Every structure is written in structure tokens, then in C-alpha cells.
């Protein structure tokens, strides 16, 4: 193809629409010096695959019809890999016709990349859905140069072990010049993988955070291995946020909500790995214990819809909302509940104007690659005001650690962490604050992109 | 002992003090013209059984440890004998243990009311906890006049005679001189078991209503079968309702609502023949089909606690919670739910402000003996506002065909008939009300007492 | 048509070969006197409706698609009507898209019926999936004579007015000039519906066995009621069961079993009606209590798939299995279970020898028509051997009242009869045997099947 | 004291008589060498804490209450940690109140162990109960010498931290001069569990098999850290499997089974990381694919009661016990079951018999420490017969690598594998089993024991 510069992802950056933020937009600089192209699945089930000239990007669509999406976007990557990764918290299922699809469907992803990409181009995979790409790429194409970046968590090797593919999956990921992570865990735990599973050689020290690289001994050629934490484009959420239709709708949401003196805030797509019947089990008992007032003290949680066609997300919906309505019941009044659940897409103006209005923001995660929701909150909050909850089993809790962080796993001390927040005097929450946002601020997804494309290029 | 009139019940009339209404309130003007006993458990574990004289009546407290209730009251009563009366909507448990000491308790019973009662008294047992109380009296005291009114359903006979000890309940309830239940069905059904089980010669002919009574023939004694459809003091409820103090917390409940243009009510102690879940299921596929706003209309459902050491009923208030959770997650806004679900006690005067608010009451039971929350609803409209959605399934049914009727198992029909009641012509709604009213003050509940009280004195 | 003699049931009497014993068979002599049709489905989804002669017949096909099948076969009849007529052991699932498609096959049955119908010609409509059959056929064809014969329990009126189309089912068998049950308990339920839904005139009396008939008004029409209690060919089974084969058959069968001193046998189509997890229960205690031997006594239960596509059906399979599971694991040896279960399909031939190696049959349904089964094993016993064990809740308990007759509910009494069963003398066992088969060999299905024709032809 | 050898583990080595075989018997010879001692709970509740002389050993007994054993062992133990160190399998629970008497409990034990032990002692601190003594052992007699053997898996720290007092754990562990594992995989999880937790300084290269052994540094004292694989007293079953009784036993055994022509057994404590499901899953799909001949072919599982007030427990026994009933009743006969099971304790000649009439032993845990069984079979194998099918995820599968190694989670490959050791020829059959016993013979527990205390006597 013509294109010396591509990125390849389970879908196009797009909505049809370009989709604001996030990557695409953290790259606009680099596609103003290159040719680049994007490979990836449209949103809709079968689709013609002719490209589209999005002016600043070429896009190169691939063809999935429905049973390609149920079995390997529905079933392998999101209930054979998803709940693997991290930390088996639902039991994974091992089926091999998602098997047989997933390679199927990474193949022609690969394919589709070689028909974008120029002699010589850098190539840069996606995530957990296509992590035999830089394999099967290599092999059509191998002159190529080619980075890999998990957004998700690498698991121990103990789990990881489980899949009957791991050696396939394994292979696969070795294709690239370049296998990144948010942190220096699955880097290291990428290495040892390598050696106990492929019997590569490998570097032993410790992985450094955009720095310290590892390296993989595969024949002839090295694989570099690295961790670069994702974050937001931090300058343009904390302008936004100040807009003055933004801060209107902030004091409209707490007037709505019958003017509390504290709103606790959740966002999160509804996943089990999110952590939200934590909070609504520390709420609960805070209120059974009287140490948190249900006379002025609100918990609002806006879930997205996630993965209906998955039987654990079902589930797990079911009770996420037995516990909504039970505290309702219990601690609630006419007229006035004690937790404000909502379950439907939210537009991102109305998301910021939660952020801004929230005093407590509770991310609980039991296993989370970065999450951005922690950091979006802290580049919203230039008023300093609010409090951040974190857990520690987050990629961003390695740092915001300045943040009120939490074991989810340690009931008795996230509610005492949530009193406490609740209770910050102004001047310690600003003291938090005023130190999260000079992390978020000044480590954006600008940093992390030039430090892992950096990286990239020097494989060459 | 010295009482000439005496009422056995599982609970003595008290809260301590006097309990408010109700049957003892009912009796005031006979007790006025008799030397009266109540006979029954103060409702706390392990008691004195020392009389106390409460002016207008004598009080002989039973002594229950917390094991008695558990296995005759929690056990027997609620899990065995409730769920078979009421077409077995729950599976009942048949219990040796239990059965043995239903036994004994009942004996217990009747020990207390033979020491109470003078000779020639006339007793009155009350409802299902105490349906072997009747025989054992006569064994004791064969001088005394027995009647015994059941509160609940009599079930059909193919259900009845799962019971393993069907044949000593059936020839418990013939101890009695007379034997009364809300409804003809249930009398048809008594002397249909009487003949099946037992061989007695009984009356063919239905049974009227206050009237036109069955008999049974037992040995050299004739028990009478009767219909005897308990009611309110509606005179009192329709003065009370129109309080200032009650017009305006109606006022005030509909403020806190945000004042919607319609306000759906329902009010039930949490049971499962309560039918609660399919107000729930119609209201959630109303909204969901469009027929109802969900801007402006507001369903608004007081559960009081119920029989939280009985399984059955903890799995119920988990799956009623997830509904409650389910709808407002997926039609509420924040701070504004479209279900307001309360799980606690509810004052009197606080219930009927919610009558005097609500525009449509939902009362749609599985299966009920009479519902006198129905009735309430009734004798709080003076103003002739107001809607009735009654279920066929209740003895209400029978008297108030003016309301609402639904079959609460034709869902598509109870959806159809709640958008009638919400959306009525003000001369329509007050056409029912109006009707409605004239039934429930001129059959109120000193109709009933009198006339089940003239035909015990009958079989004298 | 050209057939005065015409029999309507969800199937045809064939396999193709036709079908051996049973209804058809019983015709048998009928037939060789009159022109006979038989309308039914096929048993295979979308078939011809081509006539087929089968010398003695000339068989009707039905078609049905697989949608057809879904929703009012495995839909309407098996998972709304049969668990509400079967005391709603089961809840039942009452869906408006089953009803119109019940409705449909129905009316099809009846398009089909007038086809082959000559002017004036018998029709005898069987069992609960045709109910609305009657009424269309006498709307289609007023010169016909129509019986309706139910084989299935008819329930208490409480239970019935739960379908939301009660009107319909009851105004679709009033079509019929006859309408019979195995049970006068049966017939005065449908007597009482009359009156309370329909408002129709009835008759008040008790209703006899094939006698003493009820009668329900309808305009000018009259209706016929009845009790026809079903049986088998009595002495036909008598012969085979002595057959030589058979005979060493069940030798054999002992052998396998390692020559226990006693074998007790449940045989059944899986169903949660049949109470089979009752008898597992009960022999499981009576194992742990050490009144029965676990070295000299087995329990050998032959169940026969069944509506694999009905949920219910499939959790019910679960829960026999673990109990089946269960008891060998705590109370047998390796190479010697103390529970053998098979689920699969028996041949005839086999079945006959299992009845005569059974030293106890078990027949304990919580809810059955009438159930062959009991009889079948009364006929196979001309040695006087064996004892029966039977349900009080199943139309043959009416007539086999010698047998050890037990409520299923009252597991203490199951367990004591089964001891008894398993330890009689041998001439209390003889006694027992001789007296159940004088009544089942002079109560088979011929004179069934003429009691019914005649009480028919009686209203012509 | 007067001991200056002494171990401590959760129980006594006794049944009261002295427990047969294992660690107690393993030591024998250093007993006859030193004053030795052994701390532990003799099993039942509320027990005196006096000493015991039993000649060879002095029993120093702990007292635990019913309620330690619920909190301590049956909570904390069984149902936090037990899950957690085997990758989740079953969800752990977090109870402050189990932790509390972990400590208390642990404390003593330290407490008796110090009593126990003389001046500069050495101790040998048993397994997971008992985590926390080390430490609790140091500080209140600096002067001793402490070793840990954990004998079940240590978990990757991804999963460990998720426990509220990991660091209260982890400081325990190293109380030790010498902490030991299975494998050097758990040795290098703890290494790096130090350096990310504690934040002490330990070595970086891989840990050897009973050598290059790792270390941690904490203060001024270095604790080291080693991987020595348990075994067990080999020759000394493989002398009693030679037993003519045995042998007799063992013909028996195929004769009662109706002399299959395989036998696949399995023998495994009640444990849902046993894999006991999966074999019944396999099994049942190779008689559906007709892989396996259902009229030859016989499985018996042996399944010894474990934790029954445990409720994971009593749901994955409901679990295993349907799996058995629904194959038999898919593929079994009448006198021929294709799964025998039994659910009871079984004695050790009764288990040596079934390793001697097995063709396939069945080993497939999900997670296992080491598991001995399956080296038990081999050293009961002298004839060489036999064919051991072992999952990976066994410590055993480090040293057995001749067997048929298996990931249990690729379930297409488990059943590949039985169908392949079902069929293999005579020849590879033994080559295989020779090749096994070569390094269970030589690689036996007083091997291990010595290695341990010769590397523990090294810390001095
Ligand atoms: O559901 P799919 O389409 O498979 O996507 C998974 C997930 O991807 C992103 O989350 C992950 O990446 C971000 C950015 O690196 C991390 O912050 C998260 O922790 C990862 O889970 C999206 O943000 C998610 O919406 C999406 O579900
Ligand atoms: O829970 P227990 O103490 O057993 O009491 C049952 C029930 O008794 C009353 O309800 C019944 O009687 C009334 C009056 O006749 C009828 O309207 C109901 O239909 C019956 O169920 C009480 O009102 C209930 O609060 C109570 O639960
Ligand atoms: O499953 P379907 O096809 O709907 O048939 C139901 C049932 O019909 C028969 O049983 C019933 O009739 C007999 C004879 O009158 C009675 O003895 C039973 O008690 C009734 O249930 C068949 O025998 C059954 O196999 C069939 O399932
Ligand atoms: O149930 P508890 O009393 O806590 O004991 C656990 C377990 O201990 C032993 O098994 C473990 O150690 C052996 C020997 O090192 C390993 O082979 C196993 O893999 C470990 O799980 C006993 O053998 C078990 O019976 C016992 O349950």
C-alpha cells in the first residue's frame, strides 16, 4: 500500500463520525508528517472493506459478519481473554470454535494491514483482541516494523498457563519488534512467560517505566519489551471542564438532587471487573452503621451498558441492581433515595459536569489495566476541590498515589477511606488534589504516545 | 374462670399499649353489655401468663418461648399452612416437628381460654394458627358455645389433602359450633372436604352471604358453615382522612415527588401472594412500550417486613429489590426515579396521607383473603379522586366490581387496565369511587362482627 | 367425508407401523362395524395431509411445523396447561403467542376432523391439547356427535381461572355433547366452572362412575358429564407376562443385579408430576435409618425422556441425577449401586420383565390422570407375587385400594409403607394381588371405551 | 524445654494411635537421634494441652476450642487462604473476625512450641495453618532455628495482594532462616513478593530444585529461600503392593466390576482443586463420541469426604453427584454402571488394591502443591502395568514428565489423552512406568527430609 505509518484496532476511530479524543487525536500531529492509515472493524456487521479517505487518515475497514463478532469479539476476547487477564475474577470459558475464529479474524486483520502498509512502514497493533497480528504480519511482511500495546492487564504466569492456545497467543505477541504495557508488572511477567513457556532467553532486571527496557531473544532478532502508562489529553479536559454551560449543569445536577452537602460518584462500564458492588455493599454498611448521613450524602453511579449478550454481564447486572433498590428500600425516603443508578450510554459534556459536581469520586476496581476515569476526574477538578478513591489494583494507582487508595478487597478500610474523603478538611483535599493534577498534567497521552513510538523507532 | 365472652387469637390486641382499630375495637359496644376476655401471646418470647385487666377486657397473655414460635408460628403457621391456603404459590414444608408443636401450642391455647371462660361463654377463635383450638375446647368444655372465623383462603380440596395431618385440622375446625370464612368458595370447599375426608353428611346448596348457611352433621351435633366478608370501621378512616394535618402531608408527598401528574400506589406487608413483582413487571414494559410517561407518572410502593427468618420470603425481597433497582436504572433520571420503593414499618397516618395522594392504588394479590387495604383506599376518597386496580384473586373483589378487576396472571390485560385508571375521565373516576363508597360504609366491619355473632348465638 | 365413526388426538396411532395396543386397539372391534378415521399429527414437523388407509383405519394427517410444535405443543399444552392442571407443581407460563397458536392447531384439528366427517358421524375429540376442538367443530359441522375425554387431572376452579383465557378452554369443551373425566372429582370441578364462569345451569348432585350422569345447560343444548375411569387390555397383558421369554428375562434381570433379595422399581416418563425425586428421597432415608439393607435390596428406576426442550423438564433431570448420584455414593459399593437409573427408552418387552422381577413397584406421583403403570404391573403378576406402592393423588388409587396406598406429601408414611412393601408375608402379598387384578382384569380399557360410546350415543 | 528437635504442624501425628507413613515416619531416624518433639492440635475439640510421651516422640497438644476450629481452620484456613493460594478457583472470603483467631491461634502454637523447645533448637514449622509462628516464634525465643515448608502452591502476587493482612503474612514467612516451597516457581513468587511488598533486598536469579538456593534480606539476618519437592516412603509402598493380599484384592476388585477390560480410577480428598469434574466431563463426551467402549470400560472414583461445613464444599459435592447419575443413566445398564463413585473414607490397603487393579490412573487437578497419589501409584506399579494421566499443574508434573501430562483446561486434549492411555500398547505402557519409578524411587521423602534440614542446619 501507501501508507508508511499505521495503526490497526479492533474498530475505526469512528462513531458516521470521527470519534473525538483519545488516540486518534493524540496521533494528529504525527499523521500531519506521515501517511497514515487506520485498520479496523466499522461497528456494524457485514460491511464492504474499501477504504475511506478521512482527509487526515486513510481508513481500511474490515468485514466481520455477526457470528465473526459473537465468536471472536463476544466470545473469545470477552469471555475467554477479558476475564483471564484479569485475575479470573469469572471463570473463563475455553471454547475452540472462538479459537479457530480468533485466528481467523486476526488474520484478516493482518491481512489488511499489509494491503495499507508501505515498504518499510511502522505499524502499531491494538490490544488484547488481536495479539496474533504482529506474527501473522511479520510473516506476510517482514520488512516491516511492528509495536504491540496491551491495554489491559498481562496476568501471572500461573494463570496465563490456562489457555490452551498460551503458546499460539504467546508466539503471536512475540511477532513484534516492540510488546508494551501500562506497567512494569506485565512486562516482567511477559519475560518470564517467554522463558518458562517459549524457553527464549531473556533480560532479568526490573522493567523501568518508559525507560529500562527488557529485551526477548527470539533467533536472529531481539524483541524490546516496555511499559508506557496510558493517560488523557489532560490540558483540553481541564479547559473544558471550566466552560460555563458545564458548571451550570454541575450546580443544576446537585439542585436535582435536592442539594446535598456530599455527592459520591461512579462511572465505570458495567463490568465485573469494575469494582461497583463494592461500593454499594461500604455504602450500605456505612449507613447501617450510621457513619455516613442519609440525610444529606448521595451516591450517584452512571453504568454504560456493556457486553449484553454475554451471560456473566447479565448477571451481574442483576445484582448491581438488587443492591440499588435494597439500599433504596432500607435508607432511602419518598421522594428521596440514598443512591441514583442509572444504566444508559452518557453523553461526555454530562459526564464532565458529574466530575464537577461530585465531592467524592469512587473508582474501586478489583483489576483495571490504567482506567482513565481517575485521571479525567483529576483534570476536571482545577477548582481543587473533591477526592479521589482509588484501588490500588488499577494501573493508575501507580501514579496517583496521592489519591485516597484502597485494597476493594479490604472492606472495613474502603469505608473507612470513604468517611474519610467525606470528610476532608478543604485545605487536605486541595493538598491531594493540587499534587494529582500535577502527575495528570504533566504526563499526558502525548508523553505516552512519543515514549512508545520513541521506542519503536529504535528498534530499526 | 369469670368471662361470659371470650376471643382467641395468636396475639393479644396490644403493641405497651392497646392497638388502635381492628377487630377489639369492633367488640367495643359488646364488651360494654359483656364480661370480656382476649386470649392470646403478647407477641415477645417467654412471658408471665398472669391476666391483666385492661378496663374494658381482661387479657390472659400465653406464654411462647422463641422455639414455640419458630416451629408453630414461623414454621407451621407461615411456611406450612399460609403458602397451602393460598393456592400454593410458595411450595410448602411439611414438618413432623413443626405439626407437633402447632399441637401443642393450639392445646396451650385452649387451656387459657377454658381457664378464662365462665360457663356457658361464648368463644370466638380466630384464623389459621388455631384451627385444632375448637375440637380440643369442646373436649375440655363441652358447655361452651364455639365459633371460629378463618382469615385467610380455604383452599381447594386437591390441594388441602397434601397435608399429611389434613384429617385432625378438618375435624379441629368441626369442634366449632359454627365455622365462618370470607367467602361462599370457602365455605363450598369446607363442606365439600367434610364430606370427602371425614364421611360427614353435609348441606348441597351454596352458600349465601350472611346468610342461606351449609351444615354439617356430626354425630348428635350440627356445625354451621358461613360467608362472612370482613370489612373496616370505614366511618372512622373516611373522618380521619379528611384531617388538615392529613390533606396536607398528602400535599407535601406529592412536592417531594416533584409533583408528578399521576402518582401509583401500592402498600402490602412484603408476601408473595401480595402480587408486587406484577405491578412492577407491568409498569416496567409500560414504560418500555411508551404507554406510560415517564416524566410525569410515578409508582410509589410501601413494603412493610415480613417474616424475615422464613426463606421464602428473604428470596422474594431480593428478587422485588432487583426490579425496583432494574426500572429506575433504565427509565429514571438522577434525581428523579420513576419507582420509589420503601422497606420499613409506615405509620397509620402517614399510609393514609399516601391514600388521600395517590391516583391510582395498586392492589393486585396472587391470592388474598379479603385485603382491607382496598377498603381503605375507599374510605379515604371522600373527595371522590382516585382510582382502585383490584385483583379477582382477593375476597375484595367480590364487593367492590366498581373498581379496576384484573386477573393479575393476564399481564397484557393488567398493563391495558393500568393506562385506563391513569388516564380516566374525572367524572368516570368519580362514578367507580362514588359506587364504591356506598358498598364500604354501608358494609363496614361492625356489619360483619354482628352478623357472624348472631349466627353463633343461633346455634344456642 | 366418508367416515361415521372419527377419532381426534394430538397424534396419529402410528410409529412407519402402527402403534400396538392402547386406544386404537381397544376401537378394534368398532372399527370392523363402522367407517373409521382418525385424524392426527404425524409426529414429524411439516408433513402432507394426504389421507393414508390403513386398512381398518383411514388415518388424517396433521401438519405441524416446527414453529407449530414449539408453541402450542411444547408451549401451550406442555408448559401452560399441564402444569396448571397438575396442581401447579410447576409454575405456568402463561404467553399470549402460545394461546393464538393453540388456538390455530386447534381449529386446524377441527378443519381437519369435518373433512373426514360424514353427515351425522360419531366424534370422539381426546385430551387437553384439543379442548378448543368441540366447540369450532360444532360451529363447522352442527349435524355431528361430539365427546370429549380428558386424560389428564381436571383442577379446582381457583387454580383453573388463572389462564387468562379460563372463557375460552371452558366454552371450547361445552362444544361437545359429552364431556368425560377419569374421576367424578373431575367432572364436578368442570360442573362448578360451569356455574361460576360460564353461568351456566347445572346439575347438583355427585357425579358417578360411569353413571349418574351431570349435565350442564346450555340454551337449547344439553351437556353430558361423566366419569369414565381409563384401564388397560388386562388380558392381554396377562398372557405376554407369562410368556418364556419374559420369564428368564426377568431371571436374568436378577442375575445382573447380583440376585438381590429384593428389587423395588419405579418406571415413568420423566416428569415432575411422577414424584419420583419422593421415592429417591425415602429410599435414601430409609438407607441411612438402617431399615432397609444395602447389601440385599435395590432400587431400579427407568425413566423416559421427555420434553428435552421445556426447561423445566431439564432442571428436573438435574435434580435426579444428583440424587441418584448421591445415594450410591454414600450407601453402595464399587461394582455394586443400590440405585440403578436408566434415562432412555424402554422396549415393551423389556418393561414387562422388569414388572415381573420387581419385588415392590413404586407409583407415588404427586398428580396423575389416572396412571397405567400401577395397572400394567397388577397384570403382569398372575404368580400373586410383588406389591404395589401407589399414590393416594392418582386416578388408580380410586380403584386400587388394596394396594399400599400413600400421600406422597407424608414422607414418613411413604417411608413406613415401603418398609411394609419390602418385608410383607407371603400371603398378605397374594391377598393384596389377588384382590387388585380381579378388579383390574374385569375393568379394562373395552369396557371403558363402551361406557363412553355408549353414554355418547345416549345423547343422540 | 527439653527438645532440641522440634516440629510443629495444624495436627498431632496420631488417629488414639500413631499415624502410619508421612512426615513422622520419614523422621524416624533423626528422632533416634535427638530429643524430639512435635506441637500440634489432636483433632478434637477442647482437649488438655499435657504433654504425651509416645517413646520416639514427645506430643506437646494444643487446645482449640469448636469455635477456633470454625474460625481458624474452617474459615480462615479452609475457606480464605486455601482458595486463594490455588489461583481462585472458589472466590475467598474476607472475615476480620477468621483473621483475628488465625493470630490468636497461630500465637499458640508459637507459644507450646517455645515451652517445647530447649536452647538453640531447631524447629520445622509445617504448612499454611500456621504462617504467621515463625515470626511470632522469633521474637519470643531469638536463640531457635526456624524452617517453613509450605507443602500447598504460593500464588503469584497478583493474586496475594488481594489478601487485607498480605503483609502480615508475608512478615510471618519471614520469621524463618529457611522458607521452602515445592517448586521453584512459588520460591521465586516469594522473592518477588519480598522486594514488592516488604521492599527487602533479595537475590534475583532463578532457585534451584533442593539447591541455588535464593535469599531475602531483612535487617541484619538473611532468610533463605528453596524449592524441595515432597515424595514419598516408595520402596515401602512398593514392598505392600507386592502383598499377596493385596494382589488377591485387587483380582477381586476387577471381578466385582464384571472384569472390564479397563479400569480408570481416581482418588482424591473431596476438593473442587482436585479436577474430579473434568474427568467426568471427558469420560462423558468420549462415550458420546463412541471413543470409549461403554461395555468394557469402567471409571471408579474414589472421593474421600472433606470440609463438609464448608459450604463451597457441599455445592461442588451436589455438582460431582449429578455428573455421576446422568452418565450412568446415559451410558450405563441395568447391573452395569460405566462410573462407580463413592463418597467415604477408604483404608490404605483398600487404595493400594485399586492402584494395583487400575489401567489408568486418572490425576487431573486444576491446582495441586505436589499430590502424592500420583506417585504413590507409580511406586505401586512394580509389574510395570499402568499408565498415569497427570495434569501440569501439579508439583508432581515437575518430576513425572513420562506420565500423560495434561492441561486440564484444554479439555480436547484430555480426552485425546485418556482415549491414548486407554489404548497404548503394552511396550510403551512400560516403558513409560519404568521410567517413572526410576525417580520415584530415588527421589523419595527422606531425600527431601534430608535436603531440607541439611539446608535449614546451614543457616547456622
Ligand atoms: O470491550 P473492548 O472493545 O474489548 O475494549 C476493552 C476496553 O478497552 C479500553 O479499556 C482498556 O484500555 C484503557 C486505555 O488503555 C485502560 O484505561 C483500561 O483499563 C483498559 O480496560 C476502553 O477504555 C474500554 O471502554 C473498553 O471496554
Ligand atoms: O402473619 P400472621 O400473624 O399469621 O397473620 C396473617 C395476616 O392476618 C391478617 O390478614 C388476613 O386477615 C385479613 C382480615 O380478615 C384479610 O384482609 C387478609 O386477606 C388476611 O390475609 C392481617 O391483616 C395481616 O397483617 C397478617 O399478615
Ligand atoms: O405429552 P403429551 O403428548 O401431551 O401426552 C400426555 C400424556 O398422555 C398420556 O397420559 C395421560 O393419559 C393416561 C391415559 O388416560 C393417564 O393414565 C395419564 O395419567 C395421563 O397423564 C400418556 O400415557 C403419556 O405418555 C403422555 O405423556
Ligand atoms: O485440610 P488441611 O488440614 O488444611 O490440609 C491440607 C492438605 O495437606 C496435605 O496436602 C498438601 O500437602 C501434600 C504434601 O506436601 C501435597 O501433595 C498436596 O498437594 C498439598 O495439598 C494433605 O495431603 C491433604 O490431605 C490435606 O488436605
Same mark, same amino acid.
Given at each position: 500500500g501507501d501508507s508508511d505509518f499505521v495503526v490497526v484496532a479492533n474498530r475505526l476511530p469512528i462513531d458516521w463520525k470521527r470519534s473525538p479524543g483519545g488516540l486518534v487525536t493524540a496521533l494528529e500531529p504525527l499523521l500531519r508528517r506521515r501517511r497514515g492509515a487506520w485498520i479496523g472493524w466499522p461497528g456494524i456487521p457485514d460491511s464492504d472493506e474499501d477504504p475511506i479517505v478521512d482527509g487526515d487518515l486513510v481508513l481500511y475497514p474490515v468485514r466481520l459478519s455477526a457470528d465473526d463478532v459473537a465468536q471472536?469479539?463476544?466470545?473469545?476476547?470477552?469471555?475467554?481473554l477479558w476475564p483471564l487477564y484479569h485475575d479470573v475474577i469469572v471463570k473463563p470459558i475455553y471454547n475452540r470454535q472462538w479459537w479457530e475464529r480468533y485466528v481467523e479474524v486476526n488474520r484478516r486483520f493482518a491481512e489488511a494491514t499489509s494491503r495499507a502498509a508501505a515498504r518499510g512502514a511502522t505499524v502499531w497493533v491494538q490490544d488484547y483482541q488481536l495479539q496474533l497480528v504482529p506474527k501473522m504480519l511479520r510473516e506476510l511482511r517482514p520488512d516491516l516494523t511492528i509495536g504491540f500495546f496491551l491495554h489491559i492487564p498481562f496476568p501471572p504466569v500461573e494463570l496465563f498457563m490456562?489457555?490452551?492456545w498460551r503458546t499460539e497467543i504467546t508466539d503471536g505477541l512475540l511477532g513484534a519488534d516492540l510488546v508494551g504495557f501500562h506497567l512494569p508488572g506485565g512486562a516482567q511477567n511477559f519475560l518470564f512467560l517467554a522463558r518458562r513457556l517459549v524457553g527464549a532467553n531473556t533480560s532479568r532486571a526490573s522493567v523501568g517505566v518508559r525507560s529500562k527496557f527488557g529485551e526477548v531473544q527470539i533467533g536472529s532478532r531481539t524483541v524490546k519489551v516496555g511499559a508506557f502508562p496510558i493517560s488523557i489529553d489532560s490540558a483540553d479536559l481541564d479547559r473544558q471542564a471550566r466552560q460555563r454551560s458545564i458548571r451550570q449543569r454541575a450546580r443544576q445536577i446537585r439542585a436535582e438532587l435536592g442539594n446535598p452537602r456530599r455527592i459520591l460518584l461512579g462511572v465505570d462500564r458495567?463490568? %465485573?471487573?469494575?469494582?461497583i458492588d463494592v461500593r454499594l455493599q461500604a455504602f450500605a454498611e456505612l449507613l447501617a452503621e450510621g457513619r455516613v448521613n442519609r440525610e444529606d450524602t448521595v451516591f450517584v453511579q452512571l453504568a454504560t451498558p456493556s457486553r449484553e449478550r454475554v451471560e456473566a454481564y447479565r448477571l451481574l447486572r442483576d445484582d448491581i441492581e438488587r443492591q440499588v433498590g435494597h439500599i433504596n428500600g432500607e435508607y432511602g425516603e419518598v421522594g428521596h433515595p440514598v443512591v441514583h443508578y442509572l444504566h444508559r450510554p452518557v453523553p461526555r459534556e454530562e459526564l464532565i459536569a458529574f466530575f464537577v459536581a461530585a465531592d467524592v469520586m469512587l473508582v474501586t476496581?478489583?483489576?483495571?489495566?490504567?482506567?482513565?476515569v481517575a485521571k479525567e476526574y483529576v483534570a476536571c477538578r482545577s477548582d481543587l476541590g473533591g477526592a479521589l478513591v482509588l484501588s490500588?489494583?488499577?494501573?493508575?494507582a501507580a501514579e496517583l498515589?496521592?489519591? %485516597?487508595?484502597?485494597?476493594?478487597?479490604n472492606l472495613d478500610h474502603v469505608k473507612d477511606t470513604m468517611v474519610a474523603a467525606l470528610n476532608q478538611t478543604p485545605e487536605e483535599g486541595r493538598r491531594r488534589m493540587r499534587a494529582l493534577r500535577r502527575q495528570v498534567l504533566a504526563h499526558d497521552v502525548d508523553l505516552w504516545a512519543r515514549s512508545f513510538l520513541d521506542a519503536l523507532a529504535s528498534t530499526r
Open positions: 471472536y469479539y463476544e466470545g473469545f476476547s470477552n469471555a475467554t490456562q489457555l490452551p458495567l463490568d %465485573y471487573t469494575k469494582g476496581p478489583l483489576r483495571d489495566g490504567m482506567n482513565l490500588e489494583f488499577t494501573g493508575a498515589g496521592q489519591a %485516597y487508595l484502597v485494597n476493594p478487597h
